[PDB]
TrEMBL record, chains B, C:
Cu(2+) 1 binds at H195. It comes from the Eukaryota. The lineage of its organism: Eukaryota, Metazoa, Cnidaria, Anthozoa, Hexacorallia. Belongs to the GFP family. The gene is Dronpa. One of its GO terms (molecular function) is identical protein binding. This is Fluorescent protein Dronpa. InterPro entries: GFP, GFP-related, Green_fluorescent_prot. It comes from Echinophyllia sp. SC22.
C-alpha cells in the first residue's frame, strides 16, 4: 500500500535525563517486511551525553517487525495516517524513563517526533557511570486493552565486567484510525549499536524484529 | 537570603500522553510558616484534556515549617538553590515524572519545571477528569547517597466517592554542600482554592510542616 | 466488649526464602491509649536466619487511639473481629505477604498469623541481619470496595547508616457490617524494647494514634 | 546421569489465598529432554477452591525444558541434590502471590514440597470471581545474579469474554550444589489445563517448554 519494501526514516528526539536536556536527530532506512532497520544518530544538543546511550536506543517503530500472515499487523495497517506510542521504562534501581513517539509518513519516509525523559538514576549507578554494554535480545508481549495495543517486555542491559541491569517496559500503541486488532502475540527483538564514536555523538543503530505466536498446542 | 515573605515565578513545559502544554505562574509564600499560594495560567495546549490535579505538586520544600530540632536541607541550600526529580506512579499504570530547577533572584524563587506523563487509560480518572482533590499527606524523608529522598503515598479523592492512589518518589539535590537531616516527615495539604471552567486559570495553595513522628 | 486493658495471644507460622518457622506470643494492650506490648518466642526454625524486624508489624489496629471525630473501623468490628491481608514490598525486590485472623475470647484477642517472604538477596540487609529498627510511620487509610485499605511507606534504619525502604499495602475486613471511615491517618512507632542474642525472645512495643492530617 | 528420558513426579502444595487455607497433591510424569510434562492434581483440603485455579498452575520445575547443547542447563546439572525456587507473582490489580518449591529426587521421581500464598485479590476481580480462561504462552528471561539464577516473565491470563489480566513473575532458582552458570537466555513456555471436573477438585495439567537464545546477530 503506502508501505514499500524499502522505507526511509527521519527523527528528532528532545529530552532530559536527571534534569539535563539534550536533543538528537537521526536518519535511516528499514525493510518493513524483513523486520530490519538501521540508522545514524547525531547528538545536536547536550553532548557529550553524561549517561549511558543505551537507555535511549529503543526510543529511536514496530512497523519494522516481520509479521506472519496469521498474525494481524496493527502497525502496517495504521498507515498512511500512522500511530503514536507512549512508554514507561522502569529500571530495577528506581531509575525511570518515559518516552513518546508520534509517527507520521511523508512519501516513503517515516517521521518521528520523540520526547524522552528520565529521572532518579543514582549517581553511582550503571546509567550515569556509563557501565552498560548492550541490551540483550528480548520478547515483547502484545495484547489489546481498551481498543488499543499494549506491549510489555522484560529488558536487560549487560554490564561492564558481568551481570545484568533489569528494566521493565510498558508500551501503549495508538493507531490514528480504526484498524483490525490482533490477538495476543509476541515480537522477538534484538537492538544493537553497530558503531559509535568515543562519546556517542555519532551512533549507528540496528534492530531486527519478528512477530510470532509462541509455543504451539 | 530567606525572607518571611518571598515571591515565586515559574514556567512548566510538558506533555501528557504525547500532548504538549505549558503553564506559567506567579505567587508568594511564607517559608517559615510553611504556606504558599500562586496563580497559574495555561499558555499552550489549553484547554487541558487531563485532570489538572496531576500537575499541582509540581508547581518547593523551602515552603515547609521546620522545627529547630530538624535540619532544613532546603533553606540551607540558598542562595545557590537546589533541584528535584520526581516519579509519580499511579495505581492504574499511569506514570508521570517531573523535574524542577529552583534558583533565587532577589526575593523571588524561579522554577524551571518539566512535566511528562504517559499510559493514562482513556477511561481512567485522569483523562476523564474525575478527580476532586489530593488528600493531605505525610512525606517521608531520608538521606541516600549524600542527597535527600522524599517518598509519599498520595491519594486523589474521586467524583462520586473513592480514591485513586499514587506513589511519589522524589530526589532533592542541593547545588552546594549542606548539612544533611536525620529521617523525618513533612505533612502536606495542597488545594486548588479556585479555578475557571477549563482550568486555564487556577489559584493554588499549599501548607506544609515538618516533624519527627510519634515519640 | 472493648476494655481499657486487653490481653493478646498469637501464633505465627511462616517461611522466609523457603525456610519455615513458628513464633508464639503473649501480651497486653490498651486499645484507647493506642499502646501495646508483648513477649514473643520462636518455637520452630530458630535461630532465625533473617532480620527479625521484617516480622514485627505482623505481630492489630484496634490498638490505635482514635479521636471521636474519626470512625473506628476496628473497635466496631468486635466481638466478631476482623482479618487483614498485607503485602510488604522491599526496595531490593524482597517481598513478604502476611495474613492475620483476629478473634476475641473474653478479654483476650487471638491472632492466627501466616507470614511468607521470598526473593531476599543473600547479601541484602534482611538475610545479613543489618537492620536496626523501623522508623516511625504514618499509614494512610481509605475505603475501597466496602472494606478498609491502609498503605504505608516504611523504612528500616540500617547498621552503619542509611535506610532500606518497604511499601506496605494492607486490606482490613470486618467480619460484620460496620460504619466505614473517611480517609484518615494512623501514626505508628514500633520498637523491639529487648531481645536475647539470636532473637529467640523478643519484647515488642507499639504506639499508634489516628488523625486527619493538616487542617 | 541421575536423569532419565522418562521421570515421575510427586507433589504436595499447602497454601492460602486471601487467608483461606488449602492443600493439593499431585502425581505426574515428564520427559526432561523433550521439555514436556503432565500431571494429575487433587485438592485435598479447602475445596472447592473459591478462586481461579489458574493462579496455582505454574507452581506445580525447569528441569522439564528442552535445552540446546549451546545453552548451559542449570537445572539438569543440579541433580541428584536438586534445587529450590522462590517466586513472586504480582498481578496488575494489586493481587500478589508468592510461592516456593523445594525439589528433591528419589529414584526416578522428583518430589516437590510447595508453599503458595496470595493476598489482596479484589472480591470482584477475575481471580476471586473465577473469570480466567488460561495463561497465554510466554517467554521467560533468565540471567545470573549473585551466583544464582533469576527468571522473570510477563504473564497474562485470558479472560472470560475477552481481554487479558497481566501478571509479572520474578523467580529465583537456587541449585543445592555448585553448578556451571548459564549466560543470559530464554525459555518459551506453554502451560495448559487439559481437563478438570466442575469445581477443579481434579485437574489434568500439561506444560511444554524450550530454551533458546533469542534473535541472532
Amino acid at each position: 500500500s503506502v508501505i514499500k519494501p524499502d522505507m526511509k526514516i527521519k527523527l528528532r528526539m528532545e529530552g532530559a535525563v536527571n534534569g539535563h536536556p539534550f536533543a538528537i536527530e537521526g536518519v535511516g532506512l528499514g525493510k518493513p517486511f524483513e523486520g530490519k532497520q538501521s540508522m545514524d544518530l547525531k547528538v545536536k544538543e547536550g553532548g557529550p551525553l553524561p549517561f549511558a546511550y543505551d537507555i535511549l536506543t529503543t526510543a529511536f517503530n514496530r512497523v519494522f517487525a516481520k509479521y506472519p500472515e496469521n498474525i494481524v499487523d496493527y502497525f502496517k495497517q495504521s498507515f498512511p495516517e500512522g500511530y503514536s506510542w507512549e512508554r514507561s521504562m522502569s529500571y530495577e534501581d528506581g531509575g525511570i524513563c518515559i518516552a513518546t513517539n508520534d509517527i507520521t509518513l511523508d512519501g516513503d519516509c517515516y517521521i518521528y517526533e520523540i520526547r524522552f525523559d528520565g529521572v532518579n538514576f543514582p549517581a553511582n549507578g550503571p546509567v550515569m557511570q556509563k557501565r552498560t554494554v548492550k541490551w540483550e535480545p528480548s520478547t515483547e508481549k502484545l495484547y489489546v486493552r481498551d481498543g488499543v495495543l499494549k506491549g510489555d517486555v522484560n529488558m536487560a542491559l549487560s554490564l561492564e565486567g558481568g551481570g545484568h541491569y533489569r528494566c521493565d517496559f510498558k508500551t501503549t500503541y495508538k493507531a490514528k484510525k480504526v484498524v483490525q486488532l490482533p490477538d495476543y502475540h509476541f515480537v522477538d527483538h534484538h537492538i544493537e549499536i553497530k558503531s559509535h564514536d568515543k562519546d556517542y555523538s555519532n551512533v549507528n543503530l540496528h534492530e531486527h524484529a519478528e512477530a510470532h505466536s509462541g509455543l504451539p498446542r
